[PDB]
Each structure stands twice: as structure tokens, then as C-alpha cells.
Amino acid sequence: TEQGEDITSKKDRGVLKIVKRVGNGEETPMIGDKVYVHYKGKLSNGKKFDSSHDRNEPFVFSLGKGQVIKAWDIGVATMKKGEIAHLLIKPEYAYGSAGSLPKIPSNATLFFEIELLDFKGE
Numbered sequence: 001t002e003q004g005e006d007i008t009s010k011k012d013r014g015v016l017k018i019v020k021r022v023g024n025g026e027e028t029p030m031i032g033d034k035v036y037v038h039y040k041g042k043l044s045n046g047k048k049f050d051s052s053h054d055r056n057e058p059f060v061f062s063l064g065k066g067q068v069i070k071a072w073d074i075g076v077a078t079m080k081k082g083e084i085a086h087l088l089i090k091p092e093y094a095y096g097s098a099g100s101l102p103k104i105p106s107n108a109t110l111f112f113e114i115e116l117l118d119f120k121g122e
């Protein structure tokens with residue numbers, strides 16, 4: 001099943017979110033904030049897997065700057081500090097028809113688990 005809230009502006013089911021663990025505090029990050037996450041990512045079919053846990057350091061990026069795939073800019077913006085979410089992502093919000101071989105084939109649907117650790121202003 002493909003479950004989750006459609007968090008796309010276009011409502012095209014391109015990015016589907018489930019909260020797995022409710023966070024602490026009501027605040028979500030703004031565009032431009034520096035965000036710190038742990039994550040696990042895989043193809044929908046489960047044939048390639050990647051995690052921040054492998055390197056035991058957070059993944060850090062500036063939200064809403066296109067430093068990461070569109071689904072992350074959209075998805076992390078909805079998350080609270082301490083929240084764990086699952087995202088199911090159609091290729092249009094990830095790597096598209098071109099893909100990014102060998103990790104990402106053409107037109108791949110992706111899954112992520114993301115933990116929002118913290119965020120701070122620019």
C-alpha cells in the first residue's frame with residue numbers, strides 16, 4: 001500500500017508522509033535554516049539502501065535551497081525536532097527519468113526514514 005499524507009502542493013501523490021514518532025515542540029524549520037537529520041533511504045523495491053547511521057554522523061543541509069532532492073525540501077519542512085517520518089517519493093520529486101546510476105535507476109520510487117535532530121537559523 002502507498003500510505004501517507006500527500007504533502008505536495010500539486011496534490012499529485014508525489015510525496016507521501018507518515019509520522020512514525022511524534023517530535024518535541026511544535027516548531028518546524030524555515031527555508032534557509034540549517035537542518036540536522038539522521039536518515040535511511042532505499043529504492044521502493046528495496047535493492048539499494050543508504051543511511052547516515054553507516055557513518056555515525058548527521059546529514060546537514062540548508063532547507064529549501066535545492067541542496068537535496070525536491071521531496072526532502074518539501075518533507076523536512078513539515079517535521080518537528082525529534083520527529084521520525086517516512087516518505088514515499090515518486091521519481092518526479094527525486095531523480096526523474098534520468099536517474100543517477102548505479103544507486104538510482106531511471107524513474108525510481110524512493111523510500112526514506114528521516115529523523116529531524118535539530119535546526120538553527122542561517
Ligand SMILES: COc1cc([C@@H](C(=O)N2CCCC[C@H]2C(=O)OCc2cnn(C)c2C)C2CCCCC2)cc(OC)c1OC
Nearest residue numbers: 039041042043048049050059067068069072100103104110
Ligand atoms: C544520487 O547519489 C546519491 C544518492 C543517495 C541517496 C539520496 O537520494 N539522498 C541522500 C540523502 C539526502 C536525500 C537524497 C539526496 O538528495 O541525495 C543527493 C545528495 C545531496 N547531497 N549529498 C551529499 C547527496 C548524496 C539515495 C537514497 C535511496 C537509496 C540509494 C541512495 C546517497 C548517495 O551517497 C550517499 C548518493 O551518491 C552521491
